[PDB]
Amino acid sequence: MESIFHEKQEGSLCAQHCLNNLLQGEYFSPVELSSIAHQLDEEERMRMAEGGVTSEDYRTFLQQPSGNMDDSGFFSIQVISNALKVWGLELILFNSPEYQRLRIDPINERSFICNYKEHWFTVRKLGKQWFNLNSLLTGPELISDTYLALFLAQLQQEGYSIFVVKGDLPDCEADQLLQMIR
Numbered sequence: 001m002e003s004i005f006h007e008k009q010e011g012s013l014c015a016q017h018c019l020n021n022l023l024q025g026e027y028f029s030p031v032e033l034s035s036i037a038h039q040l041d042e043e044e045r046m047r048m049a050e051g052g053v054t055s056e057d058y059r060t061f062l063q064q065p066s067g068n069m070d071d072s073g074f075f076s077i078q079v080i081s082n083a084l085k086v087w088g089l090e091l092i093l094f095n096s097p098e099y100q101r102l103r104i105d106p107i108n109e110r111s112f113i114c115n116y117k118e119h120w121f122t123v124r125k126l127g128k129q130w131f132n133l134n135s136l137l138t139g140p141e142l143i144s145d146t147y148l149a150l151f152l153a154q155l156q157q158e159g160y161s162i163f164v165v166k167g168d169l170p171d172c173e174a175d176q177l178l179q180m181i182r
Contacts, residue, residue, distance in 0.1 A: 001181055003174040004126055004140045006133050012073030014120040014135050019083055021122035021133040022111050022165060024172040028083060030072060036083045037075075040067030043082070074118035077163055084165055094152065094162035104164065106130070106148045112164040114155050121160075123151070127178020142181065 005025045009017030015033040020026040028036070044066055048058065067078050081091040092099055094112065106112065111124045122133035123143070130148050132141035143151055155162050 001140070001178070003172065003177045004131065005172050005174050006131075006137075006139050008137075008139060009135050012071070014073055015069070015075035015079045015083075017133070017135055018075070018080055018113055018120040018122050021124055022080060022084070022113055023087070024111065024124060024170050024174065027087075027170070033075070033079060033083070034069050036086065037067040037069045037079050039082055039086065040078050075120070076118075077115050077161065080113060080120075080163065080165075084167070089165055089167040089169070092164045092166055094164050095156055099164070100156065106152050106164075107145045109164055109166070110169045112162060114160045114162040116158075116160050123148075126172075126174045127176070127181075129178060129181060 005021075007017055007020035007026050013030055013033075015037075016028060016030055019028045019033070041062065041064075045058075045062060048061060067076070067082070069075055069079070077091075084091055094100060094104070094114075106123075107125070107130065109125065111122075113123055114121045120135060123130055124133065126140075129145065130143045130151075132143055132151070133139070134141070152162060154160075
């Protein structure tokens with residue numbers, strides 16, 4: 001419980017708190033989140049350029065806030081999906097036809113965040129256990145191995161879009177020193 005690096009958010013910057021927690025630490029900032037948000041625009045842009053552009057359609061798409069943030073609060077999941085992808089991570093949905101009932105041990109993962117409509121909740125593994133880190137979370141909220149399977153199940157039954165970050169994360173000392181809990 002000693003070295004839990006949780007970036008305590010005060011404000012609306014949910015992309016910031018979500019990612020600065022998700023990556024096991026502070027790696028992104030508001031403007032930078034808008035910069036990565038822009039990479040969706042240009043990535044989908046190139047994606048369309050790979051096949052699916054008449055002529056004006058290209059511009060008719062670019063005249064859009066494609067991931068581009070204005071309200072620094074209701075960031076859409078794409079910002080965590082891409083921000084990890086640019087770091088060498090993958091992001092799966094936990095409500096996918098298969099992924100929802102394929103039996104992925106949440107406790108086995110390294111990190112996954114959930115989004116209720118527009119609101120983020122960060123779930124990161126530290127040590128042998130997992131911690132909830134929310135926008136207005138006073139910090140780390142403990143979640144036992146089994147209570148994790150409980151957390152996730154409640155999410156899908158409550159209306160949470162959960163997202164399982166897959167890959168190698170920037171491991172912080174928190175994971176090493178979470179062998180001590182309460």
